[PDB]
Each structure stands twice: as structure tokens, then as C-alpha cells.
Amino acid sequence: TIGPVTPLDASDFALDIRMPGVTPKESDTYFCMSMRLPVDEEAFVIDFKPRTVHHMLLFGCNMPSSTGSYWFCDEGTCTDKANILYAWARNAPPTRLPKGVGFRVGGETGSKYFVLQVHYGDISAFRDNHKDCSGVSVHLTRVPQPLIAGMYLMMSVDTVIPPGEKVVNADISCQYKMYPMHVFAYRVHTHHLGKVVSGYRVRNGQWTLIGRQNPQLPQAFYPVEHPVDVTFGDILAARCVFTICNLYIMYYMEAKYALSFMTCTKNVAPDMFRTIPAEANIPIP
């Protein structure tokens, strides 16, 4: 019965984002569906409850790739930038938002749509006629949150792995010049050749680990043990060791100064990498 929208108290409501009873046909199948916000004004996403599924992602975006009641994620998730809000893996520990932190959605600037991605692991071939409704419950409030979550995305663009080779580094750096952000989670993404990815704040030639992972693991968001403040005149730097290179850094900022999204797609301090902690080059098999 649980309607798409459940009012909770005066300025709070819950959204249920659930597959419309899809039937995964072969193993491996990624399914997407979308859900417009019911409000045009700004709202804040402050909590999530996740409902043979190995992976779920929730994104914030303005242009969903399809308009069907669900679609194969092959066709894409969003045709615009897919601001990731939430990740669930089957055994990993899910995206937990700190108290006082919310994603800002709606208004303008905010996302108008949620896009739900569901990865179905391995389906028996005999499944008698399984309709499935996996998804996420989302707690939103119109009360202003003191801290705003956003996403700093580090992206290696040009780098190229040649013949005659066994290890190639792809380095990314940008000076940070915004108000303070506090990194509380991170996720990594490469493809087959990716062996280890690490992210760091560089302050006065001193390197603080944000996080490092072998990119072939259950890409949920891993918690950053102690939140790393990144401030004005810090350099963000990442290394992908290959044999693409994305690193998603989930932060919060103070509401008055908050950006929902930032991006690094360049390498400004290439000689700094000389002085990168040795751990950045160690395998995580």
C-alpha cells in the first residue's frame, strides 16, 4: 500500500523508490527507474532505507536517460551529470549520513529526479515468474540542514597504457579553493586494468590519506575513518595504478558555503607525485 509519498510530520516526507516489478532474465542485469521529486522547492535527503540483488545506486539528476517505467541501464542512467547520492552493496556497510548532513535536491540547482539503479546478481534460469520491487526508501525534510553533502569527483582523462608495460600511473591533482569540505566517504571506479586507487589531501607538502581501494571490489562507498577537512590552498591528489580512473569523494560543507558537486579532471601539480607516500604504489589483491 505504501504510496510513493508518505507525509511524516509537518515538513518531512518519505519517498519509496522501488522497481515496478521487474523480471531479470539473465544474471548480470542492471535495471534503472526514475522518480521525480514531488516538491519544486528545495528539500534535503537526510536518510535512506534499502529494500539476488548485489548492488543498488541512487542518483540525483535533471535528465533521466529514459521515460519508461523502468529501463536497462545500458541506455544510461542520466543524460546529464549523475550526482550519486547513495550506494548499497550486498555485504559491504552502506552509505551512512552523519547527523546534520543532508543532500540538497529540488529548487533550482538541486536535482529534480532520483534515478535508481538495481544490479541483479545471478538469477536461476528456472525462476517461475519472479516480479521484483527492490529499491530504497528516502527520508526528505524541508528543514534546512546545517551541513550539506556533495560529491567531489576526480577523473583521469587522457592517460594511456602502452605496449612493453606492466605498471602505469595515472595521476590527478587540483588546488582546492572553496570553503572547507569534510570527506566522510569515497568510492573508486576503474575497469579491468585498474589495480589500486588512492586519494589524498596535500597540505604543506604533507599527504593525508582520504582512502585507497582495489577498484575490483564491491564499489559501495567506504567510510573515511576520520573525516579529512580539505580547505583553501590544499591540493587534492589521486593515483590510479594500472596494469578510466574515477574517484568519488563524498563530503559535507557548511550550508551557507555549500557546493553540491565539484570536479577535478586535470593534473596541476605533477611533480608533487614524486613525494607521494609509498602506500599509493602497493597492490591490494
User: Does the domain spanning 150-283 belong to CATH 3.30.200.20?
Assistant: no
Resolution expressed in Å: 2.4
The amino acid occupying position 28 is: D
Q: Rounded distance, CA 251 to CA 186, Å?
A: 9
Which set of grid coordinates corresponds to residue 203?
Answer: 597540505
208, exposed or middle or buried, with CB in 10 Å at 0-12, 13-18, 19+?
middle
- b/e code 107-134 from CB counts within 10 Å (16+ = b): eeebbbbbbbbbbbeebeeeeeeeebeb
226, exposed or middle or buried, with CB in 10 Å at 0-12, 13-18, 19+?
exposed
> Residue 244 to residues 3, 24, 156, 170, 282: CA-CA distances in angstroms?
40, 28, 6, 9, 19
Find the angle CA(24)-CA(68)-CA(124) to the nearest 5 degrees.
Answer: 0
R_g of the chain computed on alpha carbons? 20
The distance of Cα 171 from the centroid of its chain, to the nearest Å, equals: 20
What DSSP character marks residue 132?
B
> Residue 137 to residues 35, 121, 149: CA-CA distances in angstroms?
12, 21, 18
Residue 57 neighbours by CB under 8 Å, 6+ apart: 77, 84, 86, 87, 88, 116, 117
Element (H, E) at 36: strand 30-36
The distance of Cα 78 from the centroid of its chain, to the nearest Å, equals: 14
Domain ranges in the chain with CATH number 2.60.120.230: 150-283
Closest listed residue to residue 182, CA positions, set 205, 202, 155, 201:
201
Q: Rounded distance, CA 33 to CA 174, Å?
A: 34
Domain ranges in the chain with CATH number 2.60.120.310: 1-149
Which set of grid coordinates corresponds to residue 105?
Answer: 535536491
Q: Rounded distance, CA 152 to CA 155, Å?
A: 10
Q: What is the CATH number of domain 1-149?
A: 2.60.120.310
The amino acid occupying position 115 is: V
Q: Rounded distance, CA 86 to CA 281, Å?
A: 29
CB atoms within 10 A of CB 36: 14
What DSSP character marks residue 253?
E
